């Protein structure tokens, strides 16, 4: 019950969508998808 784009859900018009941790990813294979924030190393 929540507004925002689960992982890999597609964000070919939501790119700033994408829920708390998440990132629009466009993809050559694919259509643009909500990806999952990497950590930070």
Avoid: M
């Avoid at 784009?5 to 939501?14: A, E, S």
Wanted: proline share 7%; hydrophobic share 20%; aromatic share 8%.
């Amino acid at each position: 019950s929540e507004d925002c784009i689960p992982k890999w859900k597609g964000c070919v018009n939501r790119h700033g969508d994408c829920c708390e941790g998440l990132e629009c990813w466009k993809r050559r294979r694919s259509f643009e998808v909500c990806v999952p924030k990497t950590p930070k190393t």
